[PDB]
Amino acid sequence: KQTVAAYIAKTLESAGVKRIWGVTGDSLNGLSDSLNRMGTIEWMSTRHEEVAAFAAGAEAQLSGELAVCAGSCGPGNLHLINGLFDCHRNHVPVLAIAAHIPSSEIGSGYFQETHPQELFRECSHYCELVSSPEQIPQVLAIAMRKAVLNRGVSVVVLPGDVALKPAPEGATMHWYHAPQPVVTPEEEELRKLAQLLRYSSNIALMCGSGCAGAHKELVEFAGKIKAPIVHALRGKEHVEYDNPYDVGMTGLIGFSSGFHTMMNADTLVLLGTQFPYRAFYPTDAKIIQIDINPASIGAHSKVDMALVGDIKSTLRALLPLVEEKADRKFLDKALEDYRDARKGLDDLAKPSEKAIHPQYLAQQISHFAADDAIFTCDVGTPTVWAARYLKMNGKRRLLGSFNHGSMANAMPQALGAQATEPERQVVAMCGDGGFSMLMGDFLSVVQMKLPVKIVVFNNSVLGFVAMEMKAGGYLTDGTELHDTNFARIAEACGITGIRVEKASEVDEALQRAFSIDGPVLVDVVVAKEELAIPPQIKLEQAKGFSLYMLRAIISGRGDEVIELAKTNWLR
Amino acid sequence: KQTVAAYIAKTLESAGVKRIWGVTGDSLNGLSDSLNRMGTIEWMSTRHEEVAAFAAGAEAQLSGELAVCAGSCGPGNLHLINGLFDCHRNHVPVLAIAAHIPSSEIGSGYFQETHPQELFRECSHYCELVSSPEQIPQVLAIAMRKAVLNRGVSVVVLPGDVALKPAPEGATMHWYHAPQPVVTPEEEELRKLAQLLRYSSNIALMCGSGCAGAHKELVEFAGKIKAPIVHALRGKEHVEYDNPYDVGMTGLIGFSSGFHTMMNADTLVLLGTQFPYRAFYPTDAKIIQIDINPASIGAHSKVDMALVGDIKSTLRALLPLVEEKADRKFLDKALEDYRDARKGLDDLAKPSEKAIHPQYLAQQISHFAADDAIFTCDVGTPTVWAARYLKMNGKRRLLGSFNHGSMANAMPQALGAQATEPERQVVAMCGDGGFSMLMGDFLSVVQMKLPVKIVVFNNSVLGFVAMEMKAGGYLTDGTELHDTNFARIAEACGITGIRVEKASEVDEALQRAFSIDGPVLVDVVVAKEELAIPPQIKLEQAKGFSLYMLRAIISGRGDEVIELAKTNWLR
Amino acid sequence: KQTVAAYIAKTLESAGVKRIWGVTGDSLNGLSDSLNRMGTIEWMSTRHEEVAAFAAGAEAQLSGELAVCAGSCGPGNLHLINGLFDCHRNHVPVLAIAAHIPSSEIGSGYFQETHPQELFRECSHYCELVSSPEQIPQVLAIAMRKAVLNRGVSVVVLPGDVALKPAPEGATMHWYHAPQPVVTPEEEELRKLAQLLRYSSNIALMCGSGCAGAHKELVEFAGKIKAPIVHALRGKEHVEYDNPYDVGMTGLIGFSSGFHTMMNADTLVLLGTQFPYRAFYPTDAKIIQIDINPASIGAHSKVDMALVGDIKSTLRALLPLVEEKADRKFLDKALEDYRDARKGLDDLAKPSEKAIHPQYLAQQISHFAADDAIFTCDVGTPTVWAARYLKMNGKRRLLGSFNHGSMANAMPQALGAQATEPERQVVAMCGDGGFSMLMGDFLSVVQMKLPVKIVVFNNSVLGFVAMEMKAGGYLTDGTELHDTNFARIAEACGITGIRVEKASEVDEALQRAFSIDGPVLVDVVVAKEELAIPPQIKLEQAKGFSLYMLRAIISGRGDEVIELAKTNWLR
């Protein structure tokens, strides 16, 4: 005997949601009232709803549990969209409650009329309009279940008037927490795979976030067959610690070693991955892909053998079927290549007379940050530096907009994080473009008392300078940001602001920002690091290729792009 | 290496498709040429593309293997839509190749311009436009995989010009047939379920098509705990043979027994089901749902415990954890109720002085049809009669538009069937509305040499006559079909036509139609059977409920709707 | 001949676009290069793309000419969406260039994959994906034309690779500026209307933005038949100056006079309007609607006579057919009622001992602002105050998100404005929620050297406090903003910041902010003004009505909502 909104709120509480991120409107009165009368779920008001979505995503990513955000009708919920894409593409359980204009006015071009039911189709698993209160029990049941079990976004579109109507009287608000099933491939499929591996000399693994929770099984497997392990970016935090077979990552921002490893493998085995750079994959090697989601299978390479399976349970069952290989010439050669590849990683990662090198900053961040710190990195150079310098260990974490690829993710994701783990240290490696893109929500660290440690890579620019040639006469209005003082801004927002201009000052700023009890923004003025490009590659680019689409990589030094050549590892 | 079309066709052949259903256009020349030069995949030309879709669905349903249909650009592929919905809603693997207008003209309101990429979003798991031939390998890989492994429709939209361009040279055409994984819930979840079952007295099962292939496990489980088994319509062919615990089906067209069984159960266990009639579900019983697809869970009832799981492997694991219950008072009372409920099923199922009773026809069809015949039934009364009279045995099959609920499915599905199993007997129980709705494709049984046995329930009407009161003054233009002679039409199409007007002639017509070597249409003139409705129910209907939404059922006799009353069973 | 991007850019230049608002990406390299090599169109880089859209809209609104914005692939262009809705709903010509992921990767879940072609359907007149460079000439031709002539948004979705390919060689880049036609209803329709008006005693007009450019014709017509003129908000700047028949506006934020005027009219004539509050319209009066867009006709009221027509040319033709009415008892009574209604408008609009009253601030803004200043107001209280206190005169202008109803519009629209009219004074009446919602783009007034005068109504809250009852125990996290100092923030961004806390200081701050040569943010701390609501109305609200949906208005004083009662006017 309650409102539809109340019914939703109570069901959510049973499912265990602790908070709902968003921004109020009249179209959400039903939900507000219920939330207030209930006093159990905390309303996290943000300054732009886009940040609410991002945060919810981060919260879900860290907690592993359903997270919720909401938006008023019209522009309210629409503001969620970019964030929801990030949630969805990052495979985290997020329910989004999109309040809607009053039923009666629908179809008449009413004030604020949008069609959320339609808009969010792409960034969701489920998206329905609750026209009649009678449908709330089944609509919500599915939405939640899919979001949670299919690992993604669900959207419930709820007109303000409907939300205030009485929920069905017989409806159950109790939620049964149904965990993922055990999904392992058939014994026959496994036996095939084992024969296949047994007949392959140079075996290689490309590992992604799908390998989370399976680290033990992963290394054991790799060890048993002496197969090197390359990882995709999102697999970094789950794979690149305690790993004797680590050959790093590849792609433009990784290291050549991983590429050469796959181009010299007889058999390449994709394990829970969506590594998207098709040109980095062997053309004439047997590619075997294991993944829990059929839609992943062959999205980015050919597949000679595909197995639907949970990486953990699959490897558990596969191990007894795979005999120990003793030959490790391939593995050793790879490891060697990777060590040789991190040559020059240190080149610019040191204190400097003039401008501060980004790589130095990143190196120091990884050094002084907590051994269990949660990092976030803006899409832009912070993502490059975060991926190359942050040392993972299986306690620390790394969030970013790695699949949806949105600027300005770093701080908003950081809010989400901090709120979920208020005891833990959260470090946002932000761009100055990205920090300013959603700068309003900086005010949220104060208002929400969330002690995130923002570190802006203040380079007064959007991305690597001179994507071709340093320009002494040309200056695209596109890449140039007006010299700004974010420490000064942090200060005027009621947050500790540390401005850093000399390399000598870095270690001090970081150490202090981390130990201070509260929000700190560390405005570090870094160099406008350039990226030299071979004229041969500039040529390819004009045909319609980005550096990500070419067989090209950023050097360990980080100041130029070089062609990956065919390297046949001697017989 | 070849054309994009050829690449597709060859990949399909590797995956083992034997035929592609559709209707040619210039927009499909690439595909035609390739198909012709290849000579391996048979092009099944239909008269309306809608039937190609339907057929493909039936082919997929029977074979359990990927099936394909295609349509020209514009109206061509659009004609598929209704059929594709049926394929999709029936959970069968179907790839639809939707030819598209020439790239260049897109966006200009060209001759035949539609946007297939958008239109089929709802009836599909995957829907993409192949703009550049470069994307065909990954687009097709995903489409096929999803279609096959997620059990549904995928759509590839392919402009005629793109189809003629060269496929990527490095592309692999070999397909690895990856089977479904073994998906069973965790041991702890199972233990909970077992303890739950162990402390329940009156346990009941509602079983759906998800139980296919698990008949042995099903009965054993039901037997062990002495739990009666009600089935949903689509579970009929997989559940209602060799089943000591059979309590029939419910819903408007079933029998009361199933309803009373659930309303008197302490614990109700949904096994692979999507039975949609929410009012037929117990309000105050523990509902436990097992299903392979999280989106199914709680779609139509509350769920106190939900388990993601394959019904077969789940029951295999659950059995050793469930101790044998000896008390079977509940089971026995149910069985009794069901036998008591098929009272009057025979009432009208006998030869008659005047018009021929539909129930008689159906009874006789089930009697003279092959012991392994494949049936199909039009949405309409043929669905009612097919469900009540066809005796299943685990060899026979039953296809219909049970979820998408489209008229005129019977014959087109029948074509699909016959083509997949040319040795087998296929019987289409068609409505006269449904047979005429896509009557053009009757010409396809000739042209395709497919010996389907059409049986039209010629009642000169759309559905049950007098959904309220026989009208001696009123006659809605809505329900009345102009007296037609389909035997005569069959004859003029080059197909054996048997006209049947006297009950005495039925057994002879059927026996002959089945034994003749080829297509036979049996035009049976059946009664305009009425459906009396209590004035109390007519009242409810005016509030906005159909008979499916009420706690109401059709009598065993089949000539009136009666309210299901609350029934309590002693001890 | 050149690249597709260049082709676009050059065509745009011919059409006369002066700038393109957005934020760069690699997916826009083609467009960047062309823009740079061309040096004619200025790239206005914003901090969030949402603001680029908003601005473009404001630029289009002011200039009356096509305006353009653009976004990178994926999150880039998606950031435009909310703004584009505002552009579209405000009926302004805006082309949006949405860069897209590389063709080849489409359909594979590539990095940043979205489907812009679909997403923007709702906020646009035209939305197409340029797959082949061959289609750019017709796609762009239509997009531009529709955008311009149908007065709304068009979207061209352009993959980065396609943009770099050669445009069709034969393509014309010259644009013919085709002006709107003369659209007047047929003489017979006009004669009917004239006879209708001739036999009506109490005639009333409700006028909207459609009346722009027709002020002379409007008053003359109203004068001739002695008909009072109520206006909709968006008609304000075009109607409420030099108007002897002005009866103000209605709706929640207007004045009762307009409502009573229509409820006492025999004939009500809607002129170019989309006033959306259906409850404010007479039930028993002849409603006559004239509008240029058939979709407007009857959207919000019944229509006894509808005429498709341009308000200007229609009135020109209608005048000679309408004989002068001498009776003006109705008109006079209305005018009187309106003067009586602005009773209490002044109540709180004066210097105060304690907190500063918003109405005072607004009154003073209208007083010290330029006689031809361009205002903008955030959705929220600034919209209320802007509408009640800003005196229009036919030179000044007023922009807001009046139809799409988005927070945070004020400043971003203000940027657009200032850039289009760099000589003119632009005043953004911003909320503190709205200013902070897109606060990043505050950095744009510096970087773009745009001397907008921001005036924040710093009330530390979201909207009217206590939408029911001041809460001395309750405090919704929903409405409460953490006390912030925006003057201090303005300062740290390199912009003059004036903090204002005492009413006595207002006139000085305003006068100085306006005369200073450059950006000034005036952070005025205003009262948390309350809005008392009758318990009778709170009741109605719980049924599912907002104050906008009820026959209710905000008092002239502005501190409470009062029910509009039925009023009958003698003779």
Ligand SMILES: Cc1cc2nc3c(=O)[nH]c(=O)nc-3n(C[C@H](O)[C@H](O)[C@H](O)COP(=O)(O)OP(=O)(O)OC[C@H]3O[C@@H](n4cnc5c(N)ncnc54)[C@H](O)[C@@H]3O)c2cc1C
């Ligand atoms: C600026 C920038 C540059 C980048 N450059 C690079 C680069 O050079 N190198 C690089 O690697 N990345 C790079 N990326 C990131 C890249 O876009 C992808 O995010 C990353 O490559 C994908 O990692 P993943 O496959 O682990 O991601 P995810 O999408 O997280 O992988 C999850 C996959 O595993 C499957 N899965 C999940 N759970 C299980 C399970 N239990 N069992 C089996 N399967 C499971 C899922 O179905 C899915 O397919 C870059 C990103 C940015 C922003």
Ligand SMILES: Cc1cc2nc3c(=O)[nH]c(=O)nc-3n(C[C@H](O)[C@H](O)[C@H](O)COP(=O)(O)OP(=O)(O)OC[C@H]3O[C@@H](n4cnc5c(N)ncnc54)[C@H](O)[C@@H]3O)c2cc1C
């Ligand atoms: C005119 C008409 C009247 C009808 N009246 C009735 C009626 O009176 N009574 C009635 O019952 N129906 C009736 N229906 C049919 C009804 O609409 C449904 O189609 C049917 O009831 C549902 O059957 P189902 O649950 O087996 O459906 P399906 O959709 O076939 O059920 C499959 C479910 O099992 C799951 N599943 C599949 N494979 C597995 C697996 N390996 N492991 C675990 N789970 C799996 C799927 O996720 C899905 O949820 C009628 C239809 C028509 C056209």
Ligand SMILES: Cc1cc2nc3c(=O)[nH]c(=O)nc-3n(C[C@H](O)[C@H](O)[C@H](O)COP(=O)(O)OP(=O)(O)OC[C@H]3O[C@@H](n4cnc5c(N)ncnc54)[C@H](O)[C@@H]3O)c2cc1C
């Ligand atoms: C917080 C808030 C509160 C609000 N409260 C109120 C309120 O109390 N009162 C109020 O009035 N508004 C209010 N509004 C605004 C309201 O939502 C509408 O935006 C506004 O009322 C409608 O103005 P309009 O009819 O001029 O709109 P528009 O959409 O600008 O009207 C244009 C109409 O005229 C037609 N037209 C255009 N050109 C021509 C032509 N040449 N010839 C003929 N026809 C043409 C168009 O087809 C269209 O139908 C509020 C807005 C906000 C944000």
Ligand SMILES: Cc1ncc(C[n+]2csc(CCOP(=O)(O)OP(=O)(O)O)c2C)c(N)n1
């Ligand atoms: C919303 C959005 N707009 C544009 C892009 C394209 N893009 C990617 S990185 C980048 C520059 C990022 O600048 P900044 O935040 O300053 O980080 P930097 O690379 O300079 O460290 C742009 C414009 C994007 N990925 N997302």
Ligand SMILES: Cc1ncc(C[n+]2csc(CCOP(=O)(O)OP(=O)(O)O)c2C)c(N)n1
């Ligand atoms: C395309 C379509 N139109 C309408 C309906 C609704 N409908 C269901 S059964 C039916 C009558 C079917 O008539 P017929 O084929 O004669 O079967 P009968 O019940 O008469 O045997 C209609 C119109 C539907 N399900 N599908």
Ligand SMILES: Cc1ncc(C[n+]2csc(CCOP(=O)(O)OP(=O)(O)O)c2C)c(N)n1
């Ligand atoms: C994006 C968005 N979110 C929510 C709303 C609903 N809404 C309308 S006004 C408002 C408060 C605006 O606050 P502020 O900017 O402080 O203006 P004030 O009324 O406080 O002056 C909200 C949340 C909206 N219109 N748009």
Ligand SMILES: [Mg+2]
């Ligand atoms: Mg930067």
Ligand SMILES: [Mg+2]
């Ligand atoms: Mg019939």
Ligand SMILES: [Mg+2]
């Ligand atoms: Mg405010």
